[PDB]
């Protein structure tokens, strides 16, 4: 039956597109965002294990096989997913639908559906046919909705402006129609009978009509631009707010570029809702009026115009697709050239050292020739389309004029009426031409609505977890990890079953090696990600029953790559918690020794930074981080690696301050450096993703094992 193929929105999600295409073929539609979430795609690319897991989840009896060169057997079901290699550069998951003796039906998610020869296909796909069948738990149903009827909801509060624009357009049409008979009146009455003293009056009257059409045009333009801006701003703001509400899985799965790119396509949606909805109504009404006027004036001259419209529509519809197929290749060839140029100018040290000044020149010349060829193909398509449209338009005009003269010869129409018909054709051809060329706008708007409207349908972080405030009013409590398991996506489990307990210890130090996952432990503690199995207990209470806001404000955190906003130090330092008195900032700076570089700055605390504080070095950046952390006065502090500079006096002061707290607050310190944890009370060594040794340093040294060798290697 129907050979459905889903077009991927992003370059990374191929497996999601293939699985959605197969599910649609069997008759089940899902939002591509939800399929992508279930399969768990990383930014690098999709995984086949993710596809097999998603197929199992949806109810598909599924299996992956490493097929040989021979693929002529009948006893295996289709469609099925196999990976290909794009001209031996990178992998690409695609779905095959039906096989013939020499034809293979290969539905490329990137570009439509294609047919491949046996030898070329067998050269292109490495292995791993993914076979799927319905497993009797597969229930058909279409879950998709028309997001356009959801985005058009924004037009409801603005009905007055839309109606006023429509009325203004109607009056504009009426005046334009009325003013088009000036040539008829001129060449039928005023000149034939030489009725002077009436020419001046009629000329003034038709001048007044035109000085009134411009007013309506001006007013309509003002209202339409105001409406467009007003709706575009609302779309953009809703999308941005929901993105800020989305959980961290959404930000780890997607890159920055995609999220920002879903922000520039609000204009496309606005064009459909604001422009392409008003234009449909006004142009349909005005085209109907013009067509009726032309038909009443003369049917014979109307049929020629109708034939011209039909020819123009046929030409445009025929030429629509090859233009897109040629515009995509140009974008690809520019994306290659730009990357080549940036890579070449970035690595000039190596190029100049190795003397490759000619190789890179030749390569860039070849890429420039390729992009020029693609642009020339698009140019040829445009020239062909323009030439055909010009021939149709000119021949139509000449034929209309000749047929009008022929009608006048036999005493059927007057010359002034012929001129009036020629003037009126501008009010019938233009509206219909607008609707003919409106189809690409509607199509691209529909495409852009499926790529911004699927994001809005994800469940945000706040809604899931249940909570009750009666249980534990505070937040600070003994921390207990019980059988916590976690993996970032569908990959090797970073954390295996572990057991931890923090019984109000003065200091906790977590040490390990790169890739162990020491920071991921704290990241899980703050409820950024949820554990698959087991849980974490505070006061003998699960984190899943605690409010998000309290668990998020009472835990102070420091990142490895400290982030500094583009603002003054005062607002940057106390973001999230405004209405803070100068004493709190001054004492936080005193504890963090932030004053030392403050005196050197031209302004004490209102100094405006550059982009992300580029001029400031990382050494003071960490100090800003600890200042921001300690400003909250939290219940639990999670202090990450604060190595900074060899200025050990600053770290000594920080440690002295923390010890001078002498409070019941807990501190969890993540540091790979071995010396700095010498004076710690509880030290957890996380090796290979499992906690190995626990206790104080002195007994850990006498325990032999593995800590002994590193400790006596460092010192």
């Amino acid at each position: 039956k129907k050979y459905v193929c889903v077009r991927q929105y992003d370059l990374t999600d191929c497996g999601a597109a293939c699985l959605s295409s197969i599910a649609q073929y069997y008759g089940l539609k899902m939002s591509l965002a939800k399929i992508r979430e279930m399969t768990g795609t990383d930014t690098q690319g999709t995984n086949a294990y993710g596809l097999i897991h998603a197929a199992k989840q949806l109810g598909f009896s599924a299996k992956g096989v490493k097929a040989s060169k021979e693929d002529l057997l009948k006893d295996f079901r289709l469609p099925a997913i196999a990976n290909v290699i794009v001209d031996n550069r990178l992998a690409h998951f695609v779905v095959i639908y039906s096989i013939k003796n020499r034809i293979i039906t290969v539905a490329d998610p990137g570009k439509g559906i294609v047919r491949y020869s046996m030898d070329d296909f067998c050269s292109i796909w490495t292995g791993g046919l993914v076979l799927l069948e319905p497993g009797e738990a597969f229930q058909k149903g279409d879950y998709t909705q028309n997001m356009m009827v959801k985005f058009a909801g924004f037009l409801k509060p603005l009905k007055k402006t839309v109606l006023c624009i429509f009325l203004a357009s109607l009056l504009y049409t009426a005046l334009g129609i009325a003013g088009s008979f000036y040539i008829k009146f001129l060449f039928d009455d005023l000149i034939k009978f030489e009725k002077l003293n009436d020419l001046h009056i009629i000329s003034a009257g038709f001048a007044v009509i035109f000085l009134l059409q411009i007013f309506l045009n001006y007013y309509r333009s003002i209202l339409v631009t105001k409406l467009g801006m007003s709706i575009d701003k609302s779309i953009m703001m809703e999308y941005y707010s929901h993105v800020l509400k989305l959980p961290m899985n959404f930000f780890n799965s997607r890159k920055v570029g995609e999220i920002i790119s879903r922000f520039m396509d609000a204009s496309k949606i606005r064009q459909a809702i604001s422009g392409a909805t008003l234009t449909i109504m006004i142009d349909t009404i005005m085209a109907v009026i013009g067509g009726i006027l032309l038909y009443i004036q003369n049917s014979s001259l109307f049929f020629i115009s109708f034939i011209i419209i039909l020819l123009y529509g046929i030409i445009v519809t025929v030429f629509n697709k090859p233009i897109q197929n040629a515009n995509r290749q140009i974008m690809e060839d520019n994306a290659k050239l730009t990357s080549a140029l940036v890579e070449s100018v970035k690595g000039i040290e190596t190029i100049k050292s190795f003397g490759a000044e000619e190789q890179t020149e030749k390569s860039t010349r070849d890429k420039i020739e390729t992009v020029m060829k693609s642009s020339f193909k698009e140019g040829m398509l445009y020239i062909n389309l323009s030439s055909l449209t010009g021939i149709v338009a000119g021949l139509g005009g000449i034929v209309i004029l000749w047929a009008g003269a022929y009608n006048v010869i036999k005493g059927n129409m007057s010359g002034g009426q012929l001129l009036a018909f020629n003037a009126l054709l501008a009010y019938f051809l233009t509206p219909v031409k607008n609707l003919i060329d409106l189809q690409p706008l509607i199509q691209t708007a529909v495409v852009a609505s499926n790529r911004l409207g699927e994001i809005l349908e994800l469940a945000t972080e706040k809604e899931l977890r249940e909570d009750s405030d009666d249980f534990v009013i505070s937040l600070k409590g003994d921390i207990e990890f019980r059988n916590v398991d976690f993996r970032y996506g569908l990959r090797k489990p970073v954390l295996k079953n572990i057991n931890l307990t923090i019984p109000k210890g003065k200091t906790v130090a977590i040490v390990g090696e790169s890739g162990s996952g020491k920071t991921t432990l704290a990241k899980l503690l703050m409820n950024f990600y949820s554990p698959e199995k087991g849980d974490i207990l505070i006061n003998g209470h699960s984190i899943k029953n605690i409010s998000l806001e309290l668990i998020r404000k009472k835990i102070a955190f420091v990142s490895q790559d400290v982030f500094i906003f583009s603002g003054t130090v005062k607002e940057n330092l106390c973001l999230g918690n405004e209405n803070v008195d100068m004493d709190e900032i001054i004492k936080a700076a005193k504890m963090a020794n932030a004053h030392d570089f403050i005196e050197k700055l031209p302004l004490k605390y209102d100094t405006f930074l550059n982009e992300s504080g580029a001029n400031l070095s990382e050494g003071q950046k960490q100090r800003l981080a600890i200042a921001r952390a300690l400003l909250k006065k939290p219940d639990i502090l999670i202090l990450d690696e604060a190595t900074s500079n060899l200025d050990s006096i600053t770290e000594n002061h920080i440690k002295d301050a923390i010890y001078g707290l002498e409070d019941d607050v807990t501190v969890i310190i993540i540091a790979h450096r071995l010396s700095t944890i010498v004076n710690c009370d509880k030290i957890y060594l996380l090796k290979d993703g499992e906690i190995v040794e626990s206790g104080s340093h002195t007994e850990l040294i006498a325990l032999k094992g593995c800590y002994f060798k590193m400790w006596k290697q460092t010192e």
């Binding site: 191929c14 999709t46 995984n47 097999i52 299996k63 992956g64 096989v65 490493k66 076979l131 990959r491």
Partner: peptide, 17 residues
């Protein structure tokens, strides 16, 4: 079935893009 089945690691090594 068609050919030889695969283990979890053989699926792991296979990626897309």
């Amino acid at each position: 079935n068609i050919g030889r089945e695969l283990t979890d690691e053989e699926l792991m090594e296979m990626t897309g893009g």
